[PDB]
Structure formats: C-alpha cells, structure tokens
Amino acid sequence: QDLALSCGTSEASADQDKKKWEPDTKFLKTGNSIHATATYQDPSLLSTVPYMTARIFTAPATYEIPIKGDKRHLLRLYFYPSTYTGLNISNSYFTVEANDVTLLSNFSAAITCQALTQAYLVKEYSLAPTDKDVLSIKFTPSDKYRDAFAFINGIEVIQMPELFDTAALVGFTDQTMDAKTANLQSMFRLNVGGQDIPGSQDSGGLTRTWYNDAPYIFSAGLGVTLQASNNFRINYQNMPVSIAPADIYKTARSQGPNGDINLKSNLTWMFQIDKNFTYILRLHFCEFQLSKINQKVFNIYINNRTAQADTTPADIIGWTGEKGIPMYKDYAIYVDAGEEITLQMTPSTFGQPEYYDSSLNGLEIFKMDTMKNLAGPNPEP
Amino acid sequence: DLALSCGTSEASADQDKKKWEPDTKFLKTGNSIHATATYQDPSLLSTVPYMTARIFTAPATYEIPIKGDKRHLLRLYFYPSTYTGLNISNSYFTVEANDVTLLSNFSAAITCQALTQAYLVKEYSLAPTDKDVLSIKFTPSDKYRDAFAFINGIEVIQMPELFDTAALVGFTDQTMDAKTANLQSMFRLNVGGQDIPGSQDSGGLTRTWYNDAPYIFSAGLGVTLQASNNFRINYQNMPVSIAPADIYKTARSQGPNGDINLKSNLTWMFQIDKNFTYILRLHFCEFQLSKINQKVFNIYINNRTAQADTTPADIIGWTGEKGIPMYKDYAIYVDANNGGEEITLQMTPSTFGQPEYYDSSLNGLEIFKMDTMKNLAGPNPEP
Ligand SMILES: *[C@@H]1O[C@H](CO)[C@@H](O[C@@H]2O[C@H](CO)[C@@H](O)[C@H](O)[C@H]2NC(C)=O)[C@H](O)[C@H]1NC(C)=O
Ligand SMILES: *[C@@H]1O[C@H](CO)[C@@H](O[C@@H]2O[C@H](CO)[C@@H](O)[C@H](O)[C@H]2NC(C)=O)[C@H](O)[C@H]1NC(C)=O
Ligand SMILES: *[C@@H]1O[C@H](CO)[C@@H](O)[C@H](O)[C@H]1NC(C)=O
Ligand SMILES: *[C@@H]1O[C@H](CO)[C@@H](O)[C@H](O)[C@H]1NC(C)=O
Ligand SMILES: *[C@@H]1O[C@H](CO)[C@@H](O)[C@H](O)[C@H]1NC(C)=O
Ligand SMILES: *[C@@H]1O[C@H](CO)[C@@H](O)[C@H](O)[C@H]1NC(C)=O
Ligand SMILES: *[C@@H]1O[C@H](CO)[C@@H](O)[C@H](O)[C@H]1NC(C)=O
C-alpha cells in the first residue's frame, strides 16, 4: 500500500535519491484545490521533487489512503514554503489530522523554516495501527486567522514493522513507558560519528535518512569519530535489520584515547523540542574495536538525570556479549518547564574498567502522543 | 535495488550501463572461495558479472535487507566455465529464497550445454514473505561428495503486484489466482519486434524482451507489423511496469490473405518443466484497425481452448480503442497428458460473428511457472 505522492504534479517524477513519486490526484477525496508551482527554487534544495510543486487548500480537504488497519505506518509530510498562486505564505496556518491523531495545529511552515534556517521541512510520524482500512488525512486552514490557507508538497505512507516496545523512564528505578501502541513523531535521526545515510541506503525499505550528528554537539570538543575495519560484518542475530542499517553500527563517536581528559568532560548533544511531551531516546550501540566486557564503561545522562550510572553504567560488550553485535536502548523523559533535550556521556570509574571512554553509534528521538496529539507550537525566529 | 557481482571486491558495470557491487557484505557464511574464469566466451555480452564467481563447499546464505510487504524480482547469474582448481561439471546444488525452493540438483553446465549458450540467468518473482531479510541459501548436493555450489551474480529488485487472476485453459469461466504465487520467468518475448535490453525496460525492472522468431513452429513466419512513427501507446490505467511501450508497437500476424490464414494456426512452441502450472501472458495492442469485429481470432494453448467458440479474441472488442495496450493471462497445468514437456501457443482466424478480416496477431508473450508446494525447481535438461 506504500505511496509516494508529489502533490501538484500530473506525471511521474523522481528525486535526487532515485525515489519515484506519483501525482496525488486519485487520493484526494473532499474539497477543492488547484496545482501550484513555487516561484523561487532555493539553492539548498537537493531536488525539485516534490518540493517545487504543491496543492493549495483555501478550505478543508481530505485525502483517503488505503492501508492495512492492523499495521503500523510511517507518514511523511513535505513542506516547501514559497509563494503559491500569489498568496503570502505568512498567512498559512493550518491543522493536519491523520484519522483521530492531530499531527499539526496552527502550523506555520514559514515561521518553522525561518527558525531552523531551512528552506524545506519533512514531518515524519509513526502511526499506531488504526484498525481501519483507510487513512484519512485532513487539512484544515485555521479558523483563527482571516486569509489562512493550507498547502502540501508531498505525502508518503509506508507500512513499517512494530519497531517500538517499552522505554526506561530516566531518573526512575524500574519504571517503564509503553510505546507499543503509541503515535510518534520522529524528531531527530542521527548517524553518530558517520556520514549522512540517504533513504536509498536505509534498511527495511523504510527510506529513512540518518544525518551526521556533529551539528548537535554542544560540548567543547567533538570527541573522536571511529569507523569499523574494511569488510567488518555486523551480526544482527535476532535484532531486526529494520531497526537501523549496518552503516549506522559501522561508525561511532567516542571521547578519545586520553582517559584523563575523558574523565573531566561529558560528550554532550543538545536538541530543541516541544515542551509538555514525553520523548523516547533510542541509543544505537555496536562495539567494533574492543572485544571484552569491562573495557569501555560509561555513564549516560538525559536532561541531567541518570540513564545508566552508579553500579549499572553502560558497557556495550556487557550488553551484547560480543563485538560486532548491534543493539539499541530506549529511554523516556517527560520535558516541561526547558524546551531542549540534552544527552551526555562520560567514563565510569565503577568496576575499574580497562579504558576510560564512551561511545555511541546512532541516535533517534521520538515524541510520544498525549491524548492523540503530536502538534507543538511554532518556534521563535 | 541490488546488483551483486559475486566474487568481486570493487564496483563494476556491464555493457548495458547497469552498475554492480561486490557481494561480500551480504554474505553471512564464511570459508567461501572466489575465482575468475580462465576463458571468456566471445558470446558474453559483458565480463560483468559472469567472469567472477563465488564457490561454496558447504551451505551458505546471503542475507539481503528487503521490505517485507513487497514482491521482488530475483535473478541468479551462472557462467559454467573453467576456474582454476575446480571442475564445473561436479557442481550440483540447491537454491532457496525464504522458504521457496528455486533450484535443486541444479547443473549449470548441463543446462548451458542443452541450450547451446555459455551463460544462464534464472529469474523469479517472489511473493511477499513479510520478512525484512531475503535469505538466499546455496546448498551443495548431499548426494555427491565432491559437489559444490557457485554463483556469479545476484539481483534483487522491488516490483509491483503485476499478477492477479488467470483464466484456466480448456475450461469456460474458471480462474486461477496468482496474487500470492511465486513465479519463475520461463520466456519473455517481444513478438514481431527486436530485442529490448533491460536498460529500455519499463518500471525500472530491467527485464529483457527477446524476439520471438526462434520459437515459431508453424510453417511460415507470418507477417510482422510495425506501428507508424511516434504512434502513441495509450496505457490509460494499466501500470507502465507491465511492459514497455515498444512491445506494443510491434506484432506478428498471419498475413493479408484471409483464405490462407483460415487453413492454418500460427504456432509457437516452448520447452518447459513437466508437472507445473504455467501462466501465459499474451500482450495485445491494435495499432492498425480501429473498430470491433475487424480482426477476430481463436487462441489455443496445448491444443486446448483459450478464447474460441462464441468468445474469440478481438483486441478492439477488449480494449475499445486502437492504441490501448492490454494483456490476458491463461493458466495450464502441463503433465504427461497435457503436452509433456512442451507448451504450444496457436492462433487462427475465427469464423464467429463474420469479421471483416480473417487474421490474428500478438504483440508480446511472457510465460511463468507457478510454484507447487513452495517449489519451482525442475530437472536438468537432456543433452
Ligand atoms: C499561531 O502561531 C503564531 C506564531 O507562532 C502565534 O503567534 C505568536 O505568539 C507568540 C506567543 O504568544 C508571540 O511571541 C509571537 O510574537 C507571535 N507571532 C506572530 C507572528 O503572531 C499565534 O499565537 C498562534 N495562534 C494560535 C491560535 O495558537
Ligand atoms: C541430478 O541431475 C543429474 C543430471 O540431470 C542426474 O543425472 C542424469 O540422470 C538422467 C536420468 O536418469 C540420465 O539420463 C543422465 O544420464 C544422468 N546424467 C548424469 C551426468 O549423471 C541425476 O540423476 C540427478 N540426481 C538426483 C539425485 O536427482
Ligand atoms: C506577508 O504577510 C505578512 C503578514 O503579517 C505581512 O506583514 C507582509 O507585509 C506580507 N508580505 C507581502 C510582500 O505582502
Ligand atoms: C505546558 O504545560 C504547562 C503546565 O501545565 C501549561 O500551563 C501550558 O499551557 C502547557 N503548554 C502547552 C503548549 O501545552
Ligand atoms: C556529566 O553530566 C552530569 C549531568 O549533567 C553531571 O552531573 C556531571 O557532573 C557531568 N560529568 C562531568 C565529568 O562533567
Ligand atoms: C510427474 O507427475 C507424475 C504423476 O504424479 C509423477 O509420477 C512423475 O514422477 C512426475 N515427473 C516429474 C519429472 O516430476
Ligand atoms: C488450430 O489449432 C487447434 C488446436 O490445436 C486445432 O483444433 C485446429 O484444427 C487448428 N486449425 C487448423 C486450420 O489447423
């Protein structure tokens, strides 16, 4: 049932990553709308597909997408804020609903793009099984602003495995958060210590993009990036390959070879998020240089609270049992009053490890829905 | 989509601008052997992927990340030549792909010798298995101690669900479902037209469509037809992945003499594997006539009825307009009392409804083997 719809097109198209797109026409169910073309092509666009073409809604409109009601789905909304049909994009405020889940509300693509110094947006969601064979995507211009309108450049609907289970609540002992039936928004997805991974190289056929993590490091010093040897094989064992592609686990960011400096600092990532949501941090690990337990043992903190410390710090081989075996660990945190998530790691002195270091291979951050809502406020410029 | 040239360590490209990459990072099992052939047959269209092979002396498995809900095209390339320190005629092995048996006791040397070709490409369409890994397992025969397995190239390509139902030959108004079937591509023909390389195939599937003349059994090659310059094939709602436009721009017909056409069947014959159900996909497009009841013809498969009597074939009658392409699927179980090892396709004009012409035509032809008990493996041919 997978779809890649470029809205506002009339023939097939393909982007710079060879992904094939088709017109959205046969899936638009209610309302009126016209095709529109952007008046300015930003040089930061990796492709004109699907960004340069849009469908404009000056009144509510609904898509109906056939899906398997028993399955989880990825939903991607592509937005390219430009001048369409002579309208000022600053008047665009609208709501997007996927069945009973609110994804966006008073959403301003123009404001959101300006705050991120970015010409385009991709909003990605993982929707729990609906038990309905139709996914209704409804666009509603705001009733609070006069001249408000909605727009969309591309829509992707991708069936995906149930890759979410439970997550350990940070700072609490033996408290878990269940995400098995949660609706999630992908906030960030990083190949830590490695290059961007395009969707064409993603596993599971999910065409996820994994970005390099360097822009999110806020500690002084970016550590030391590592790469597995030539033809090193990642031994997934019973972990589904859909969790993350092999190239995620073939690279990592570490603190470095000097244990004394490592003991005096935290490797620190920071991320801007929306307040009043619980977030899941999925940390991907794979040891490809060391071989034994108690060689590399490190503490991990999330928002200044403990996620592996004290007498149970992180040790990849301790968790996996053998070098080359990949793994992930899910942690949960409720964020209220700030609006950023900080991830920190530093060596542990517990148990006298051979080295004083820390490492991480990949990172994903998901927002969990609260009463069927994932929509946050627009950022400040 | 993946094109693995087995036994290589660097990326390569063939004669049709297809890029290939080494297979090593997808191989799960160790202690394989890689070898380069010591003789390059001049009939090879390219040294890629044929001239390099991987050899297995024990069961070996490739693990290829896939999307579980997708149907996939799977191609296996074999070049039974001389490799240093190996006897290729000793090779008998099994190939399975996610619980589907593709080959068993397979001898690439014997198969190549019977076909009088130096290389082999086996192509399969694998139904969704709802797993994110395609496990391709090569098992040397446990009947022969010195038997080993080998492979030169592997292709895995996502493909749409291009198969639905098929009309059962010889029975009226009875259908066969192939939506979830595993298929082997047996023949793929551009009827009346030139070879179409994979680079010119539709839907990114890089299928090759071959001219059909070698398979004509009837006395007389009929008359080939070609559409006018820039003739527009109007697919409408038929997916373009079904077949490229040039398939529908050529056809083979019986000819302009309706009196002679009524006295004979235009006949193709194909060698296949006994004890299997086969689907014949007949591709049609009328690019000369414009009205219903102008060309009306009977079609027979294995001397049995597939559109005859009061429901014969009429392209415009099916399509409604010239220039629109289409296909019809017919299914037949071939055993000892149904042709043995052969499929025969026959067409002749119909006398029902008094058509304006007495002719028949066909634009393309694909033959697929359906799996039985998750098995597609047949015996080796006879020298
Ligand atoms: C719709 O979104 C706009 C933009 O975020 C909101 O307007 C801003 O409100 C914040 C906080 O009240 C101010 O700091 C900004 O200066 C405002 N910007 C603009 C351009 O107005 C607005 O409140 C939202 N409307 C609703 C109904 O939620
Ligand atoms: C494996 O395949 C070989 C090759 O087809 C089989 O050997 C042939 O068997 C046929 C039928 O009896 C004979 O006519 C040929 O002379 C044989 N050729 C050779 C080279 O032996 C063999 O029987 C198959 N083995 C199994 C276990 O199925
Ligand atoms: C765009 O809309 C905003 C709405 O606040 C307005 O201030 C601005 O003048 C508009 N720009 C143009 C070019 O009309
Ligand atoms: C965030 O939570 C505070 C505390 O209850 C509440 O006052 C505020 O309205 C919330 N903001 C949003 C956007 O939900
Ligand atoms: C690491 O971060 C935690 C939480 O922010 C802090 O308590 C600790 O002192 C830091 N450790 C080092 C070595 O900076
Ligand atoms: C074909 O089917 C018949 C009938 O069951 C069986 O006896 C025979 O062994 C089969 N032959 C082959 C080559 O599969
Ligand atoms: C055409 O083929 C059918 C099926 O084999 C046969 O019954 C018929 O006699 C043939 N017609 C001619 C004219 O040979």
Q: For residue A359, what are its two tokens?
A: 């490492």
Q: Within 13 Å, how many C-alpha atoms sit on residue B87's CB side? A: 4
Indicate the SS3 state at residue B290. coil
Measured in residues, chain A has a length of 381
Question: Which atom number of ligand 1 is nearest to the Cα of residue A379?
Answer: 5
From the number of C-beta atoms within 10 Å of its C-beta (0-12, 13-18, 19+), residue B321 rates as exposed
- Distance between CA A131 and CA A70 in Å, rounded? 5
- What are phi and psi for residue B242, nearest 5 degrees? -60, -45
What ranges make up the beta strands (E) of B16-119? 19-22, 33-36, 52-56, 60-65, 71-78, 93-97, 100-106
- Distance between CA A273 and CA A363 in Å, rounded? 15
Domain locations in chain B as residue ranges: 1-159, 160-383
Q: B269 C-alpha vs ligand 3 centroid, how far in Å?
A: 73
What ranges make up the beta strands (E) of A222-276? 224-227, 251-254, 267-272
Contact pairs from chain A to chain B, CB under 8 Å: 34
In this structure, are residues B346 and B301 in contact, taking their beta carbons and an 8 Å threshold?
yes
Residue A185: strand pairing partners: A125, A367
Residue B344: strand pairing partners: B269
Which of B63, B67, B204 is nearest residue A205 as measured by Cβ atoms?
A: B67
- Distance between CA B35 and CA A156 in Å, rounded? 44
- Distance between CA A33 and CA B18 in Å, rounded? 41
Residue A98: strand pairing partners: A101, A137
A196 alpha carbon, distance to own chain's centre: 13
Supply the DSSP string of B219-236, one letter for each residue. Answer: SS--EEEEPPTTPPP--T
Q: B323 C-alpha vs ligand 7 centroid, how far in Å?
A: 29
Residues of B in contact with A1 (CB under 8 A): 69
Least Cα separation, residue B267 to chain A (angstroms) = 39
Q: For residue B253, what are its two tokens?
A: 């017909």
Q: What share of chain B is helix, strand, coil (3-state, %, to 5)?
A: 10, 40, 50
Q: Where do runs of H (alpha helix) occur along chain B?
A: 108-115, 245-248, 258-261, 315-319
In this structure, are residues B352 and B312 in contact, taking their beta carbons and an 8 Å threshold?
yes
**Edge-to-edge strand order for the sheet containing B52-56?**
B33-36, B52-56, B149-151
Q: Which residues contact B208 (CB under 8 A, 6 or more apart)?
A: B188, B195, B196, B197, B198, B201
User: Nearest to residue B378, comparing CAs of B114, B178, B159, B42?
Assistant: B114
Which of A231, A241, A246 is nearest residue B132 as measured by Cβ atoms?
A: A241
Residue B210: strand pairing partners: B189
Indicate the SS3 state at residue B245. helix
User: Nearest to residue B182, comparing CAs of B64, B109, B96?
Assistant: B96
- Residue B38 is given by DSSP the state S
Indicate the SS3 state at residue B108. helix
- What are phi and psi for residue B169, nearest 5 degrees? -65, 140
- Distance between CA B204 and CA B155 in Å, rounded? 13
In this structure, are residues A154 and A5 in contact, taking their beta carbons and an 8 Å threshold?
yes
Chain A (3-32) residues lying within 8 Å, Cβ to Cβ, of chain B: 20
Residues of B in contact with A161 (CB under 8 A): 68, 132
CA-closest residue to ligand 5 atom 10: A266
Indicate the SS3 state at residue A318. helix
Residue A21: strand pairing partners: A13
Q: Which residue has the tokens 């793994």?
A: A327
Supply the DSSP string of B201-213, one letter for each residue. Answer: -STT----BEESG
Q: To 10 degrees, the CA torsion angle through B308, B163, B129, A179?
A: -140
> From the CA atom positions of chain B, what is the Rg in Å?
22
- Distance between CA A123 and CA A114 in Å, rounded? 16
- What are phi and psi for residue B270, nearest 5 degrees? -135, 140
- Distance between CA B361 and CA B214 in Å, rounded? 17
Give the burial string for A233-253 (b: 16+ CB within 10 Å, else e). bbebeeebbbbbbbbbbbbbb
Least Cα separation, residue B188 to chain A (angstroms) = 25
Q: Which residue has the tokens 């006398």?
A: B351
The amino acid occupying position B115 is L
Measured in residues, chain B has a length of 383
In this structure, are residues A282 and A341 in contact, taking their beta carbons and an 8 Å threshold?
no
Q: For residue B194, what are its two tokens?
A: 């030139």
In this structure, are residues B300 and B276 in contact, taking their beta carbons and an 8 Å threshold?
no
In this structure, are residues A219 and A266 in contact, taking their beta carbons and an 8 Å threshold?
yes
- Residue B358 is given by DSSP the state -
Chain A (242-271) residues lying within 8 Å, Cβ to Cβ, of chain B: 242, 245-246
Residue B298: strand pairing partners: B348
CA dist list (Å): A31 to A27, A57, A58, B270, B271: 12, 8, 9, 54, 56
In this structure, are residues B323 and B340 in contact, taking their beta carbons and an 8 Å threshold?
no
Geometric angle at alpha carbon A17, from A244 and A37, rounded to 5°: 125
Is B70's Cβ below 8 Å from some Cβ in A?
yes
Least Cα separation, residue B76 to chain A (angstroms) = 22
- Residue B276 is given by DSSP the state E
User: Nearest to residue B149, comparing CAs of B203, B88, B196, B240?
Assistant: B88
User: Nearest to residue B34, comparing CAs of B77, B85, B75?
Assistant: B85
How, if at all, do strands B19-22 and B2-5 pair? parallel
CB spacing of A240 vs B132 below 8 angstroms: yes
CA dist list (Å): A42 to A51, A119, A130: 10, 7, 37
CB spacing of A246 vs B70 below 8 angstroms: no
- What are phi and psi for residue B198, nearest 5 degrees? -60, -30
From the number of C-beta atoms within 10 Å of its C-beta (0-12, 13-18, 19+), residue A282 rates as buried
- Distance between CA A178 and CA B142 in Å, rounded? 49
Q: For residue B120, what are its two tokens?
A: 């082999």
Ligand nearest to the CA of A348: 5
Cis-peptide into A347, omega within 30 deg: no
Q: A103 C-alpha vs ligand 1 centroid, how far in Å?
A: 18
Residue A267: strand pairing partners: A345
Indicate the SS3 state at residue A310. coil
Tell me, in Å, the resolution of the deposited structure: 1.8
- Distance between CA B155 and CA A201 in Å, rounded? 16
In this structure, are residues A256 and A224 in contact, taking their beta carbons and an 8 Å threshold?
yes
How, if at all, do strands B183-190 and B210-211 pair? parallel
Q: For residue B261, what are its two tokens?
A: 């056409």
In this structure, are residues A77 and A4 in contact, taking their beta carbons and an 8 Å threshold?
no
In this structure, are residues A129 and A69 in contact, taking their beta carbons and an 8 Å threshold?
yes
